[PDB]
Amino acid sequence: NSKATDDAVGSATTQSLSFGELGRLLDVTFDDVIWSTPDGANNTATGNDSDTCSTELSNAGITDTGLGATGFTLVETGAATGVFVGDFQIPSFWCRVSDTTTTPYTYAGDEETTTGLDIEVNYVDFRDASGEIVEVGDSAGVRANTGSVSLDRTVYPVPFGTIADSSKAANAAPNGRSVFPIHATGITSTIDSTEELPTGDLTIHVRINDPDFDENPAGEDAMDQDNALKISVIRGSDSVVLGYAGASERTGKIDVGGNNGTISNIRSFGEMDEIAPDAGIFELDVNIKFTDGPASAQCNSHDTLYTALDGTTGKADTNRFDDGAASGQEYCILQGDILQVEYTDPADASGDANTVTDSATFDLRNGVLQSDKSVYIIGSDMILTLIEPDFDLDNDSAETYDLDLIEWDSDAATTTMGNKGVTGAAAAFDPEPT
């Protein structure tokens, strides 16, 4: 730090002359400013915030705080080749030097992202072709790519729950609850846990295409930017956020409209993982419950029990959401609601903050049966085909649903043809698959 040639290629000894510094051989400059690591007693500046530049770089995880930190040195190609090759990796964050007129250098109090800035090198040539000092260097730019966020499907089905998610007494009918039971003949006076479809938390996969986070061309990469991805559901003028992604996975509740200023109380899904070592696309699997939606009075038909997202085991409203629902209203998702994903790119093509959005719409569609033919010989194979969009909860896998949803109606008998039917029924059809 004492010598004026700090973080410069050369030797510690240095004399000041008309052509610059004697000990200065090669320098690397971002925005025509020498890249140096904060050190000495001149790096006490904190900038607009209370965090020092060195502490900010340490928190950011950038161990390449300067040229010396990277260990960049010039090595000859061969014994007598005369060509020197040196290399280093460009950091995401660097500390700008406030002024170069003092030794040790006085650094700025805040770091800035190197994207978009021009990286320039300067090799100090002691003897040119005529045998004197000529200053030669090269120029290059630190490129950056615009972030993009995409969703698997343009539309998504409305999620459904079970009986255990409602505080209402047991009934033979849903009575407006978010329950998906069998056709009435499959239920015996009360809908219990063995006669309804399993929990219908649809699993949406969020994908982003940010080459900036693809630091390793043939290695594992993860989006480690804190809270860069926001997942939210909007119904008109009201909005609710499902959680945050990119930071460390943590427990949290559900915020409505981003009212909670403190971000540590929001649920975090963790860091997204790259799909392939040379792809640069990160995918995160997140499931949405039928309760994860804006409050509305249309959903009072079910006295919903809310599964706790925090450490407590209680089923109260405050366990899953930051605030309780309004009196006469319950958190839920209706038909036509818009599902949107928010991603904040730390560096677009301009190397700044940028927000990109993708949207999906909740919908519910009718179900229709189909068969390969109309007439069938008794004992033949019936290719029973059901085409209905809302049962495709996960696009990445093929789910299965109970055959009991269909019922046999004929003069012989009336049964659900499943395990909930009459004795000996399910054996008669021998489903393949079951």
């Binding site: 003028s237 903050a353 927000t355």
Partner: protein, 125 residues
């Protein structure tokens, strides 16, 4: 030329003079010496940065979203808060501006001291 409320406007500037470095994406509106002044008929944002589309293109591009005002029941359901009226943002992409249902957008650019080039727009239903 004509916008509604809760709408986003893309602002483009062709300023070859400010292409200071070919390998550096130049910026305008960052400092008080070279300010960018976006304004409505009642609201405005100060020191709005604009970013070059390319490293050596000479064209600056940025967008601002007009957040409107929260004192209106546009949906008609009987409650306010239809538009999150908020004036904030200083970067090239995060600008937020409040705008009445009958207002006019004004973007002003300075290329030298005491000289300013301005652009205009209008707001209707």
């Amino acid at each position: 030329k004509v916008y509604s409320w809760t709408d986003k406007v893309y602002i483009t500037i062709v300023a070859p003079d400010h292409n200071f470095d070919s390998d550096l994406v130049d910026e305008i509106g960052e400092t008080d010496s070279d300010p960018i002044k976006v304004s409505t008929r009642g609201f405005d944002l100060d020191n709005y940065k604009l970013v070059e589309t390319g490293t050596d293109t000479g064209i600056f591009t940025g967008e601002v979203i007009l957040t409107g005002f929260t004192a209106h029941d546009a949906d008609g359901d009987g409650n306010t808060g239809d538009a999150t009226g908020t004036t904030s943002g200083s970067g090239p992409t995060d600008g937020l501006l409040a705008t009445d249902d009958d207002d006019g957008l004004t973007v002003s650019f300075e290329f030298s001291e005491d000289e300013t080039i301005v652009g205009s727009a209008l707001i209707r239903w």
